[PDB]
Protein backbone atom coordinates (compact mmCIF):
# COMPACT_ATOMS: atom_id res chain seq x y z
CA UNK A 62 0.00 0.00 0.00
CA UNK A 63 1.87 3.04 -1.31
CA UNK A 64 1.27 6.45 0.37
CA UNK A 65 -1.65 8.58 -0.78
CA UNK A 66 -1.27 12.34 -1.23
CA UNK A 67 -4.55 14.20 -1.43
CA UNK A 68 -4.98 17.76 -2.70
CA UNK A 69 -6.70 19.94 -5.28
CA UNK A 70 -5.41 19.44 -8.81
CA UNK A 71 -3.35 22.64 -8.53
CA UNK A 72 0.21 23.44 -7.55
CA UNK A 73 -0.64 25.41 -4.41
CA UNK A 74 0.66 24.26 -1.03
CA UNK A 75 1.61 20.74 -2.12
CA UNK A 76 3.82 21.26 -5.21
CA UNK A 77 7.10 21.27 -3.21
CA UNK A 78 6.08 17.98 -1.58
CA UNK A 79 5.50 16.38 -5.00
CA UNK A 80 8.95 17.51 -6.13
CA UNK A 81 10.52 16.06 -2.98
CA UNK A 82 8.84 12.67 -3.46
CA UNK A 83 9.96 12.60 -7.09
CA UNK A 84 13.49 13.63 -6.14
CA UNK A 85 13.62 10.78 -3.62
CA UNK A 86 11.98 8.45 -6.12
CA UNK A 87 9.36 7.41 -3.58
CA UNK A 88 6.29 5.64 -4.87
CA UNK A 89 3.01 7.36 -4.13
CA UNK A 90 -0.52 7.76 -5.41
CA UNK A 91 -2.46 11.01 -5.52
CA UNK A 92 -6.11 11.72 -4.93
CA UNK A 93 -6.68 14.86 -6.97
CA UNK A 94 -9.84 16.89 -6.50
CA UNK A 95 -10.90 18.65 -9.69
CA UNK A 96 -12.27 22.19 -9.71
CA UNK A 97 -15.87 20.97 -9.41
CA UNK A 98 -15.24 18.22 -6.85
CA UNK A 99 -15.39 20.31 -3.68
CA UNK A 100 -18.53 18.36 -2.81
CA UNK A 101 -16.55 15.15 -3.23
CA UNK A 102 -13.97 16.44 -0.75
CA UNK A 103 -16.53 17.61 1.80
CA UNK A 104 -18.17 14.17 1.89
CA UNK A 105 -14.81 12.52 2.58
CA UNK A 106 -13.20 15.22 4.75
CA UNK A 107 -14.18 13.71 8.10
CA UNK A 108 -14.17 10.12 6.83
CA UNK A 109 -10.44 9.57 6.32
CA UNK A 110 -9.35 9.17 9.94
CA UNK A 111 -7.58 12.54 9.90
CA UNK A 112 -7.28 14.26 13.28
CA UNK A 113 -7.16 17.70 11.65
CA UNK A 114 -9.10 17.28 8.34
CA UNK A 115 -7.63 19.46 5.59
CA UNK A 116 -5.97 19.56 2.15
CA UNK A 117 -3.33 18.39 1.60
CA UNK A 118 -3.36 15.12 3.52
CA UNK A 119 -0.87 12.26 3.46
CA UNK A 120 -1.90 8.70 4.30
CA UNK A 121 0.38 5.67 4.33
CA UNK A 122 0.95 2.47 6.31
CA UNK A 123 2.40 4.42 9.23
CA UNK A 124 0.61 7.77 9.54
CA UNK A 125 -2.28 10.02 8.56
CA UNK A 126 -1.24 13.66 8.27
CA UNK A 127 -2.52 17.10 7.29
CA UNK A 128 -0.78 20.51 7.20
CA UNK A 129 1.45 20.86 4.14
CA UNK A 130 4.58 21.64 6.17
CA UNK A 131 4.12 18.68 8.51
CA UNK A 132 3.77 16.45 5.46
CA UNK A 133 6.85 17.65 3.58
CA UNK A 134 8.95 17.52 6.77
CA UNK A 135 7.73 13.98 7.52
CA UNK A 136 8.84 12.74 4.12
CA UNK A 137 12.21 14.47 4.56
CA UNK A 138 12.55 13.17 8.13
CA UNK A 139 11.99 9.60 6.91
CA UNK A 140 15.09 10.12 4.78
CA UNK A 141 17.17 11.80 7.49
CA UNK A 142 17.04 15.16 5.70
CA UNK A 143 15.81 17.49 8.48
CA UNK A 144 19.25 18.17 9.96
CA UNK A 145 21.85 16.38 12.07
CA UNK A 146 21.72 18.70 15.08
CA UNK A 147 19.51 21.45 16.57
CA UNK A 148 21.55 24.20 14.90
CA UNK A 149 21.27 22.58 11.47
CA UNK A 150 17.60 21.72 11.90
CA UNK A 151 16.94 25.35 12.87
CA UNK A 152 18.82 26.60 9.80
CA UNK A 153 16.55 24.42 7.67
CA UNK A 154 13.42 25.62 9.49
CA UNK A 155 14.55 29.22 9.03
CA UNK A 156 14.91 28.64 5.29
CA UNK A 157 11.37 27.18 5.21
CA UNK A 158 9.91 30.27 6.87
CA UNK A 159 11.88 32.62 4.64
CA UNK A 160 10.54 30.86 1.53
CA UNK A 161 6.98 30.90 2.89
CA UNK A 162 7.14 34.69 3.36
CA UNK A 163 7.54 34.86 -0.42
CA UNK A 164 5.11 32.08 -1.42
CA UNK A 165 2.42 33.15 1.03
CA UNK A 166 3.17 36.77 0.18
CA UNK A 167 1.89 35.95 -3.30
CA UNK A 168 -1.19 33.99 -2.27
CA UNK A 169 -2.36 36.66 0.18
CA UNK A 170 -2.87 39.15 -2.64
CA UNK A 171 -3.72 36.70 -5.45
CA UNK A 172 -7.38 36.47 -4.47
CA UNK A 173 -8.08 40.20 -4.36
CA UNK A 174 -10.05 42.20 -6.92
CA UNK A 175 -7.35 44.87 -6.56
CA UNK A 176 -4.50 42.47 -7.33
CA UNK A 177 -2.65 44.94 -9.58
CA UNK A 178 -2.33 47.57 -6.88
CA UNK A 179 -1.34 45.05 -4.22
CA UNK A 180 1.09 43.57 -6.74
CA UNK A 181 2.97 46.87 -6.99
CA UNK A 182 3.60 46.95 -3.24
CA UNK A 183 4.53 43.26 -3.11
CA UNK A 184 7.02 43.58 -5.97
CA UNK A 185 8.67 46.55 -4.26
CA UNK A 186 9.32 44.32 -1.25
CA UNK A 187 10.24 41.12 -3.13
CA UNK A 188 13.80 42.27 -4.07
CA UNK A 189 14.96 42.50 -0.45
CA UNK A 190 13.48 39.06 0.22
CA UNK A 191 15.17 37.53 -2.84
CA UNK A 192 18.50 39.15 -2.02
CA UNK A 193 18.81 37.18 1.23
CA UNK A 194 18.54 33.97 -0.81
CA UNK A 195 20.89 35.40 -3.45
CA UNK A 196 23.55 36.01 -0.78
CA UNK A 197 22.88 32.61 0.75
CA UNK A 198 23.63 31.03 -2.63
CA UNK A 199 26.78 32.93 -3.56
CA UNK A 200 28.92 30.25 -1.92
CA UNK A 201 26.47 27.33 -1.86
CA UNK A 202 25.13 25.03 -4.58
CA UNK A 203 21.86 24.49 -2.69
CA UNK A 204 20.31 26.30 0.28
CA UNK A 205 21.94 23.99 2.83
CA UNK A 206 25.17 23.40 0.93
CA UNK A 207 26.22 20.61 -1.42
CA UNK A 208 23.14 18.48 -0.78
CA UNK A 209 19.48 19.12 -1.53
CA UNK A 210 16.98 19.64 1.31
CA UNK A 211 13.22 20.21 1.14
CA UNK A 212 13.53 24.01 1.35
CA UNK A 213 15.24 23.86 -2.06
CA UNK A 214 12.00 22.58 -3.61
CA UNK A 215 10.04 25.16 -1.64
CA UNK A 216 12.23 27.97 -3.00
CA UNK A 217 11.97 26.51 -6.49
CA UNK A 218 8.17 26.58 -6.26
CA UNK A 219 8.22 30.18 -5.01
CA UNK A 220 10.53 31.27 -7.85
CA UNK A 221 8.34 29.50 -10.39
CA UNK A 222 5.38 31.44 -9.01
CA UNK A 223 6.89 34.96 -8.82
CA UNK A 224 8.31 34.53 -12.33
CA UNK A 225 4.70 34.27 -13.52
CA UNK A 226 3.86 37.49 -11.68
CA UNK A 227 6.91 39.25 -13.12
CA UNK A 228 9.19 37.42 -15.62
CA UNK A 229 11.97 39.92 -14.84
CA UNK A 230 11.99 39.79 -11.03
CA UNK A 231 15.13 37.64 -11.12
CA UNK A 232 17.14 39.75 -13.58
CA UNK A 233 19.19 41.27 -10.77
CA UNK A 234 19.62 37.88 -9.08
CA UNK A 235 21.83 35.60 -11.24
CA UNK A 236 22.40 33.01 -8.48
CA UNK A 237 18.65 32.50 -8.08
CA UNK A 238 18.30 32.25 -11.85
CA UNK A 239 20.97 29.53 -11.90
CA UNK A 240 19.52 27.84 -8.82
CA UNK A 241 16.18 27.44 -10.59
CA UNK A 242 17.91 25.91 -13.61
CA UNK A 243 20.00 23.69 -11.34
CA UNK A 244 16.86 22.24 -9.73
CA UNK A 245 15.39 21.55 -13.17
CA UNK A 246 18.69 19.86 -14.06
CA UNK A 247 18.20 17.18 -11.39
CA UNK A 248 17.37 14.01 -13.39
CA UNK A 249 14.32 13.03 -11.31
CA UNK A 250 12.92 16.57 -11.52
CA UNK A 251 13.48 16.99 -15.27
CA UNK A 252 11.78 13.63 -15.79
CA UNK A 253 8.86 14.70 -13.58
CA UNK A 254 8.32 18.08 -15.23
CA UNK A 255 8.16 16.23 -18.55
CA UNK A 256 5.82 13.50 -17.29
CA UNK A 257 2.02 13.26 -17.37
CA UNK A 258 1.89 13.65 -13.58
CA UNK A 259 3.11 17.25 -13.71
CA UNK A 260 0.49 19.90 -12.93
CA UNK A 261 1.66 23.24 -14.33
CA UNK A 262 -1.47 25.26 -13.61
CA UNK A 263 -3.13 26.76 -11.66
CA UNK A 264 -0.72 28.18 -9.05
CA UNK A 265 -3.37 29.15 -6.50
CA UNK A 266 -6.95 27.92 -6.36
CA UNK A 267 -8.94 28.27 -9.60
CA UNK A 268 -10.89 31.24 -8.21
CA UNK A 269 -7.78 33.37 -7.68
CA UNK A 270 -7.37 36.65 -9.57
CA UNK A 271 -3.71 35.77 -10.13
CA UNK A 272 -2.46 32.27 -10.82
CA UNK A 273 -6.02 31.02 -11.07
CA UNK A 274 -8.23 29.72 -13.87
CA UNK A 275 -7.87 26.50 -15.85
CA UNK A 276 -5.16 27.80 -18.17
CA UNK A 277 -2.16 30.18 -17.81
CA UNK B 278 26.21 35.65 27.48
CA UNK B 279 22.53 34.74 27.76
CA UNK B 280 20.43 34.49 24.55
CA UNK B 281 18.85 37.64 23.14
CA UNK B 282 15.30 37.60 21.79
CA UNK B 283 14.44 40.60 19.64
CA UNK B 284 10.93 41.67 18.67
CA UNK B 285 8.39 44.47 18.83
CA UNK B 286 7.00 45.08 22.30
CA UNK B 287 3.81 43.23 21.38
CA UNK B 288 2.60 39.66 21.74
CA UNK B 289 2.43 38.89 18.02
CA UNK B 290 4.52 36.06 16.56
CA UNK B 291 6.87 35.71 19.53
CA UNK B 292 4.54 35.32 22.55
CA UNK B 293 4.53 31.48 22.41
CA UNK B 294 8.34 31.51 22.36
CA UNK B 295 8.44 33.66 25.51
CA UNK B 296 6.09 31.25 27.27
CA UNK B 297 8.28 28.29 26.24
CA UNK B 298 11.46 29.92 27.58
CA UNK B 299 9.70 30.75 30.85
CA UNK B 300 8.29 27.23 31.10
CA UNK B 301 11.79 25.81 30.64
CA UNK B 302 13.19 28.43 33.01
CA UNK B 303 15.84 29.43 30.48
CA UNK B 304 17.64 32.70 31.04
CA UNK B 305 17.29 35.22 28.25
CA UNK B 306 17.32 38.93 27.54
CA UNK B 307 14.95 40.73 25.21
CA UNK B 308 15.53 43.63 22.87
CA UNK B 309 12.09 45.20 22.64
CA UNK B 310 11.34 47.75 19.94
CA UNK B 311 8.74 50.29 21.06
CA UNK B 312 6.01 51.55 18.74
CA UNK B 313 8.13 54.51 17.60
CA UNK B 314 11.43 52.64 17.28
CA UNK B 315 10.99 51.25 13.78
CA UNK B 316 13.86 53.51 12.75
CA UNK B 317 15.97 51.94 15.49
CA UNK B 318 15.22 48.49 14.06
CA UNK B 319 15.94 49.48 10.46
CA UNK B 320 19.39 50.80 11.39
CA UNK B 321 20.25 47.50 13.10
CA UNK B 322 18.39 45.09 10.80
CA UNK B 323 21.37 44.25 8.58
CA UNK B 324 23.95 44.80 11.32
CA UNK B 325 23.25 41.80 13.55
CA UNK B 326 24.84 39.06 11.45
CA UNK B 327 21.44 37.60 10.56
CA UNK B 328 21.29 35.70 7.27
CA UNK B 329 17.58 36.48 6.86
CA UNK B 330 17.05 39.78 8.77
CA UNK B 331 13.62 39.91 10.40
CA UNK B 332 11.66 40.17 13.67
CA UNK B 333 11.76 38.12 15.78
CA UNK B 334 15.41 37.13 15.92
CA UNK B 335 17.24 34.94 18.42
CA UNK B 336 20.95 35.35 19.11
CA UNK B 337 23.01 33.29 21.54
CA UNK B 338 26.47 31.76 21.85
CA UNK B 339 25.63 29.09 19.28
CA UNK B 340 23.32 30.57 16.64
CA UNK B 341 21.70 33.61 15.05
CA UNK B 342 18.14 32.92 13.92
CA UNK B 343 15.07 34.58 12.43
CA UNK B 344 11.61 33.18 11.54
CA UNK B 345 9.45 32.76 14.64
CA UNK B 346 8.82 29.05 14.03
CA UNK B 347 12.49 28.24 13.51
CA UNK B 348 13.23 30.00 16.79
CA UNK B 349 10.60 28.28 18.93
CA UNK B 350 11.52 24.88 17.45
CA UNK B 351 15.23 25.49 18.11
CA UNK B 352 14.59 26.19 21.77
CA UNK B 353 12.39 23.08 22.00
CA UNK B 354 14.94 20.99 20.07
CA UNK B 355 17.67 22.00 22.53
CA UNK B 356 15.52 20.37 25.20
CA UNK B 357 14.66 17.26 23.18
CA UNK B 358 11.02 18.32 22.83
CA UNK B 359 10.48 18.07 19.04
CA UNK B 360 9.63 14.36 19.02
CA UNK B 361 11.40 11.02 19.40
CA UNK B 362 10.68 9.69 15.91
CA UNK B 363 9.49 10.93 12.49
CA UNK B 364 5.87 10.03 13.27
CA UNK B 365 5.90 11.94 16.56
CA UNK B 366 7.79 14.90 15.11
CA UNK B 367 5.20 15.07 12.30
CA UNK B 368 2.34 14.98 14.81
CA UNK B 369 3.92 17.96 16.55
CA UNK B 370 4.46 19.80 13.25
CA UNK B 371 0.84 19.12 12.30
CA UNK B 372 -0.32 20.65 15.59
CA UNK B 373 1.83 23.73 14.88
CA UNK B 374 0.22 24.24 11.48
CA UNK B 375 -3.28 23.68 12.84
CA UNK B 376 -2.70 26.34 15.51
CA UNK B 377 -1.24 28.77 12.96
CA UNK B 378 -4.38 28.47 10.80
CA UNK B 379 -6.22 30.00 13.76
CA UNK B 380 -3.60 32.55 14.88
CA UNK B 381 -2.80 33.70 11.34
CA UNK B 382 -6.50 33.53 10.52
CA UNK B 383 -6.93 36.35 13.04
CA UNK B 384 -3.98 38.48 11.92
CA UNK B 385 -4.97 38.34 8.25
CA UNK B 386 -8.19 40.23 8.95
CA UNK B 387 -7.03 42.30 11.94
CA UNK B 388 -5.47 45.00 9.77
CA UNK B 389 -8.49 45.63 7.55
CA UNK B 390 -10.79 48.64 7.68
CA UNK B 391 -13.66 46.17 7.22
CA UNK B 392 -12.63 44.02 10.20
CA UNK B 393 -16.20 43.58 11.47
CA UNK B 394 -17.44 42.01 8.25
CA UNK B 395 -14.39 39.79 7.88
CA UNK B 396 -14.78 38.89 11.55
CA UNK B 397 -18.24 37.45 10.90
CA UNK B 398 -16.90 35.05 8.28
CA UNK B 399 -13.88 34.10 10.39
CA UNK B 400 -16.01 33.35 13.46
CA UNK B 401 -18.29 31.14 11.38
CA UNK B 402 -15.26 29.04 10.47
CA UNK B 403 -13.51 29.10 13.87
CA UNK B 404 -15.82 26.50 15.51
CA UNK B 405 -14.80 23.70 13.13
CA UNK B 406 -11.14 24.60 13.70
CA UNK B 407 -11.54 24.61 17.50
CA UNK B 408 -13.46 21.34 17.47
CA UNK B 409 -10.47 19.43 16.10
CA UNK B 410 -8.46 20.60 19.13
CA UNK B 411 -11.42 19.89 21.42
CA UNK B 412 -11.52 16.27 20.20
CA UNK B 413 -7.74 16.03 20.44
CA UNK B 414 -7.99 17.02 24.11
CA UNK B 415 -10.85 14.78 25.20
CA UNK B 416 -8.38 12.05 26.18
CA UNK B 417 -5.18 14.10 26.54
CA UNK B 418 -3.98 16.56 29.19
CA UNK B 419 -1.87 18.46 26.64
CA UNK B 420 -1.79 18.38 22.83
CA UNK B 421 0.87 15.65 22.72
CA UNK B 422 -0.25 13.77 25.81
CA UNK B 423 0.91 13.96 29.42
CA UNK B 424 3.83 16.28 28.68
CA UNK B 425 3.90 19.85 27.41
CA UNK B 426 5.29 20.63 23.93
CA UNK B 427 5.70 23.99 22.20
CA UNK B 428 2.41 23.69 20.29
CA UNK B 429 0.66 23.89 23.68
CA UNK B 430 1.95 27.44 24.13
CA UNK B 431 1.05 28.24 20.53
CA UNK B 432 -2.53 27.05 21.10
CA UNK B 433 -2.67 28.98 24.37
CA UNK B 434 -1.64 32.17 22.56
CA UNK B 435 -4.27 31.58 19.85
CA UNK B 436 -7.01 30.99 22.44
CA UNK B 437 -5.97 34.12 24.33
CA UNK B 438 -6.31 36.05 21.08
CA UNK B 439 -9.67 34.71 19.83
CA UNK B 440 -11.15 35.19 23.31
CA UNK B 441 -10.49 38.92 22.83
CA UNK B 442 -12.29 38.80 19.48
CA UNK B 443 -15.22 36.90 20.99
CA UNK B 444 -15.27 36.11 24.76
CA UNK B 445 -17.84 33.36 24.10
CA UNK B 446 -16.13 31.46 21.27
CA UNK B 447 -15.11 28.73 23.73
CA UNK B 448 -18.50 28.24 25.41
CA UNK B 449 -19.17 25.10 23.37
CA UNK B 450 -15.62 23.82 23.94
CA UNK B 451 -15.12 22.93 27.65
CA UNK B 452 -11.85 21.01 27.06
CA UNK B 453 -10.27 24.07 25.43
CA UNK B 454 -11.55 26.23 28.28
CA UNK B 455 -9.90 23.88 30.78
CA UNK B 456 -6.76 23.59 28.66
CA UNK B 457 -6.29 27.35 28.80
CA UNK B 458 -6.68 27.32 32.58
CA UNK B 459 -4.34 24.33 32.83
CA UNK B 460 -1.59 26.23 31.00
CA UNK B 461 -2.05 29.20 33.34
CA UNK B 462 -1.81 26.73 36.24
CA UNK B 463 1.77 25.79 35.32
CA UNK B 464 3.90 27.44 38.06
CA UNK B 465 6.42 29.05 35.68
CA UNK B 466 3.62 30.44 33.51
CA UNK B 467 1.52 31.81 36.39
CA UNK B 468 4.67 33.47 37.73
CA UNK B 469 5.43 34.95 34.29
CA UNK B 470 1.93 36.30 33.64
CA UNK B 471 2.18 38.04 37.02
CA UNK B 472 5.69 39.40 36.43
CA UNK B 473 6.85 42.73 35.00
CA UNK B 474 8.14 40.98 31.87
CA UNK B 475 4.64 40.06 30.70
CA UNK B 476 3.34 42.01 27.70
CA UNK B 477 -0.46 41.74 27.61
CA UNK B 478 -1.10 44.15 24.74
CA UNK B 479 -1.15 44.66 21.82
CA UNK B 480 -1.91 41.31 20.15
CA UNK B 481 -0.99 42.37 16.61
CA UNK B 482 1.06 45.39 15.61
CA UNK B 483 -0.09 48.72 17.06
CA UNK B 484 -1.59 49.79 13.72
CA UNK B 485 -4.02 46.86 13.57
CA UNK B 486 -7.77 47.51 13.56
CA UNK B 487 -8.19 44.58 15.96
CA UNK B 488 -5.76 43.77 18.75
CA UNK B 489 -3.86 46.97 18.05
CA UNK B 490 -3.34 50.24 19.89
CA UNK B 491 -1.46 50.85 23.14
CA UNK B 492 -4.27 49.65 25.41
CA UNK B 493 -6.96 46.92 25.22
Ligand SMILES: CCCCCCSC[C@H](NC(=O)CC[C@H]([NH3+])C(=O)O)C(=O)NCC(=O)O
Pocket residue numbers: 073074106114115116117127128129130164165168264265266374375378
Ligand atom coordinates in the same frame (compact mmCIF):
# COMPACT_ATOMS: atom_id res chain seq x y z
C1 LIG C 1 -0.22 29.06 -1.20
C2 LIG C 1 -0.78 29.07 -2.64
C3 LIG C 1 -2.18 28.40 -2.90
C4 LIG C 1 -3.13 28.00 -1.72
C5 LIG C 1 -4.48 27.35 -2.12
C6 LIG C 1 -5.27 27.02 -0.86
S1 LIG C 1 -4.95 25.41 -0.08
C7 LIG C 1 -6.44 24.43 0.22
C8 LIG C 1 -7.05 24.54 1.61
N1 LIG C 1 -6.10 24.11 2.62
C9 LIG C 1 -5.46 24.97 3.41
O1 LIG C 1 -5.60 26.20 3.38
C10 LIG C 1 -4.50 24.27 4.36
C11 LIG C 1 -3.72 25.22 5.28
C12 LIG C 1 -2.73 24.46 6.16
N2 LIG C 1 -2.05 25.41 7.00
C13 LIG C 1 -1.62 23.75 5.38
O2 LIG C 1 -0.54 24.32 5.21
O3 LIG C 1 -1.83 22.61 4.96
C14 LIG C 1 -8.28 23.65 1.62
O4 LIG C 1 -9.05 23.67 0.64
N3 LIG C 1 -8.47 22.89 2.71
C15 LIG C 1 -9.61 22.00 2.78
C16 LIG C 1 -10.73 22.49 3.66
O5 LIG C 1 -10.60 23.58 4.21
O6 LIG C 1 -11.69 21.74 3.79
Ligand SMILES: CCCCCCSC[C@H](NC(=O)CC[C@H]([NH3+])C(=O)O)C(=O)NCC(=O)O
Pocket residue numbers: 158159162289290322330331332333343344345346380381384480481482
Ligand atom coordinates in the same frame (compact mmCIF):
# COMPACT_ATOMS: atom_id res chain seq x y z
C1 LIG D 1 0.50 37.00 13.95
C2 LIG D 1 0.03 38.21 14.81
C3 LIG D 1 0.86 39.54 14.74
C4 LIG D 1 1.95 39.78 13.64
C5 LIG D 1 2.70 41.13 13.70
C6 LIG D 1 3.72 41.20 12.57
S1 LIG D 1 5.37 40.49 12.91
C7 LIG D 1 6.73 41.63 12.54
C8 LIG D 1 7.38 41.47 11.17
N1 LIG D 1 7.94 40.14 11.01
C9 LIG D 1 7.35 39.20 10.26
O1 LIG D 1 6.31 39.37 9.61
C10 LIG D 1 8.11 37.89 10.28
C11 LIG D 1 7.47 36.78 9.44
C12 LIG D 1 8.25 35.47 9.56
N2 LIG D 1 7.59 34.48 8.74
C13 LIG D 1 8.25 34.87 10.98
O2 LIG D 1 7.40 34.03 11.28
O3 LIG D 1 9.12 35.24 11.77
C14 LIG D 1 8.47 42.51 11.08
O4 LIG D 1 8.24 43.67 11.50
N3 LIG D 1 9.64 42.13 10.55
C15 LIG D 1 10.75 43.07 10.45
C16 LIG D 1 10.97 43.62 9.07
O5 LIG D 1 10.22 43.26 8.17
O6 LIG D 1 11.93 44.38 8.94
